[PDB]
Amino acid sequence: MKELSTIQKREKLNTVERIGSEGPGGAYHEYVIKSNSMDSQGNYDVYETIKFQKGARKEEKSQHGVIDSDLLEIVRDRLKSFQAGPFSSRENACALTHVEEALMWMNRRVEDRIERNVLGTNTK
Amino acid sequence: HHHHHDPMKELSTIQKREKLNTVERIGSEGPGGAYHEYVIKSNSMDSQGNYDVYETIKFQKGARKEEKSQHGVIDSDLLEIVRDRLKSFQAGPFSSRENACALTHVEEALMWMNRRVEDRIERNVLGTNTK
Ligand SMILES: Nc1ncnc2c1ncn2[C@@H]1O[C@@H]2COP(=O)(O)OP(=O)(O)OC[C@H]3O[C@@H](O[C@H]2[C@H]1O)[C@H](O)[C@@H]3O
Ligand SMILES: Nc1ncnc2c1ncn2[C@@H]1O[C@@H]2COP(=O)(O)OP(=O)(O)OC[C@H]3O[C@@H](O[C@H]2[C@H]1O)[C@H](O)[C@@H]3O
Numbered sequence: 001m002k003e004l005s006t007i008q009k010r011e012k013l014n015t016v017e018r019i020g021s022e023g024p025g026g027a028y029h030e031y032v033i034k035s036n037s038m039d040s041q042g043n044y045d046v047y048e049t050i051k052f053q054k055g056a057r058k059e060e061k062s063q064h065g066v067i068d069s070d071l072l073e074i075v076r077d078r079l080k081s082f083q084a085g086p087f088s089s090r091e092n093a094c095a096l097t098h099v100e101e102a103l104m105w106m107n108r109r110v111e112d113r114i115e116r117n118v119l120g121t122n123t124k
Numbered sequence: 125h126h127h128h129h130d131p132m133k134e135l136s137t138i139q140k141r142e143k144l145n146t147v148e149r150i151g152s153e154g155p156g157g158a159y160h161e162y163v164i165k166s167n168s169m170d171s172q173g174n175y176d177v178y179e180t181i182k183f184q185k186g187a188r189k190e191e192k193s194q195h196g197v198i199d200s201d202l203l204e205i206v207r208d209r210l211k212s213f214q215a216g217p218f219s220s221r222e223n224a225c226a227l228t229h230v231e232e233a234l235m236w237m238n239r240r241v242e243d244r245i246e247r248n249v250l251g252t253n254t255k
Pocket of ligand 1: 057068
């Protein structure tokens, strides 16, 4: 089925769903973030769709969208702000270090593909 | 729908070369000292000057047990999406060690985020303006 099995199991604010089918690289390129709560009339309090860059950027027929490092950079910024604020935590600091190292590995991939001159194409 | 182009508002990213998108924080600091609206916008624009990509991410603003709260996305949602995409890419033809390391770190970040949630349930402070 469609809903993601999440690491968080208790008191989840939102459900996340993959929409559509597998595409380039074997990945999905549309996701829905959905409130677990509803308003008085049965509507979701939150219903957001995230659409990924589908097909590499230099190939024809490719569809523009967000990329995964965008999401990680937003979360990185949020954790940095929370850590500079009144409600910091050790858990935040550990999560932030892992988020930044993930981003560093994603950039490692980007720079390797620039070097092998395959960035933006469907090549190993 | 939005025409092209503070750099104080744009996020300084880990990636420096061949960025697809610019990420910008919208608005002011809010609860916890954090921003709760971000825009992801393509570095390319069409023939008429409009962004090819212009998407807004709005976060749950104000803790869930407090008044005034505005419903929205939470950070672990974004990370679970990235986790799923990395898992898919790793099961596909274009796997990599870089993907594997990024995936392990993303999942451990999510594990610390859930660790925080469970610690806050234990202290009975989840959803409140409490350290
Ligand atoms: N961690 C990964 N992130 C992205 N893509 C990955 C990863 N691991 C493997 N891939 C695959 O290599 C191709 C070229 O990617 P790329 O050259 O890095 O980048 P891009 O130009 O930014 O396009 C990005 C889009 O490309 C399409 O193909 C991708 C995937 O099939 C996809 O639909 C992307 O959403
Ligand atoms: N890693 C963090 N994630 C979220 N929030 C964090 C973190 N680190 C510190 N905070 C701060 O503690 C408060 C209580 O958060 P919580 O009990 O986890 O909140 P919640 O019910 O899930 O609501 C969530 C919203 O709450 C508001 O305040 C938050 C923040 O000021 C914010 O606008 C949130 O976007």
